[PDB]
């Protein structure tokens with residue numbers, strides 16, 4: 001019997017958080033907001049509880065979980081070799097950044113890290129997440145709140161779609177600020193490696209780390225709707241595509257809304273953060289509009305839209321370059 005408890009994002013009712021903390025202590029899984037996407041979390045030191053996350057998501061065991069912390073002191077408990085990067089961390093944490101370090105803790109079971117000698121760590125800039133972790137007293141292991149393969153939940157409506165009846169508690173703090181998962185940066189190798197683009201933008205990381213490596217899998221290509229998805233990087237072929245795929249809905253920017261008939265406006269190029277904020281909602285709307293094909297306009301591989309494109313490329317059933 002899933003309880004959905006609404007809380008203020010800045011000053012959440014600590015009584016709701018306590019209820020959540022209790023469930024975590026009982027080895028239950030709960031869903032909570034962050035500034036990026038909703039997470040589905042368990043006690044990070046509880047092997048059995050973390051196993052439930054995999055079951056509930058229908059997730060491969062080889063796909064490791066991000067461990068969420070509230071203090072730099074917790075970092076010492078779980079990781080080693082981070083001391084040269086403390087200046088960096090203190091500049092972006094709390095915030096939408098996940099970093100890979102060598103695993104110290106034997107407190108974090110292998111299921112969490114998929115037997116890897118590394119651990120992904122994030123200190124989320126969302127008062128609800130921070131206050132929950134602190135009150136609970138252990139780190140929380142949490143992937144995104146969605147059935148594996150599907151778009152990451154950015155609001156409680158999407159969470160309910162995927163998890164009503166399957167978890168005891170969803171904390172609702174409204175639509176997540178960014179709409180997109182944290183930037184993941186691997187700091188275990190000699191040169192830092194970008195594993196996932198996010199709200200900490202590539203251009204910013206390149207300023208800080210001139211030798212940042214951006215693997216091919218980041219630039220090429222999860223987050224997938226139920227209907228086939230057609231991504232159109234070259235918008236001159238838009239007309240060809242529309243006519244090739246007749247029974248369709250289009251996801252488009254505002255400045256090209258008038259150029260279609262059946263269209264979801266995801267946001268404006270004027271304010272690209274609007275596009276990031278709404279893109280996953282758009283895919284969930286689209287898949288329900290009773291059309292055979294979802295057709296999405298492409299975006300610049302720059303700033304936050306880089307992250308958007310990363311997500312769409314990984315979701316698309318066909319790309320049109």
Ligand SMILES: C[C@@H](O)[C@H](NC(=O)OP(=O)(O)OC[C@H]1O[C@@H](n2cnc3c(N)ncnc32)[C@H](O)[C@@H]1O)C(=O)O
Nearest residue numbers: 034036037038039064065118119120142143144181182
């Ligand atoms: C809940 C919210 O904080 C959200 N979490 C999230 O997106 O979790 P998830 O859906 O599990 O994505 C986790 C990603 O993190 C990577 N990952 C985790 N631990 C890793 C490790 N030790 N080495 C490399 N990649 C790792 C996984 O491969 C995967 O791509 C976020 O990071 O914004």
Ligand SMILES: [Mg+2]
Nearest residue numbers: 143144146152
């Ligand atoms: Mg995910």
